[PDB]
Amino acid sequence: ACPLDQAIGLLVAIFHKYSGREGDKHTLSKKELKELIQKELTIGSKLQDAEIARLMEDLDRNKDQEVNFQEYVTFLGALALIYNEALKG
Amino acid sequence: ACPLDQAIGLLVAIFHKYSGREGDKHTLSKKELKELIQKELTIGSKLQDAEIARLMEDLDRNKDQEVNFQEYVTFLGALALIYNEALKG
Question: Could you name the domain of life of the organism this protein comes from (chains A, B)?
Answer without folding.
Answer: Eukaryota
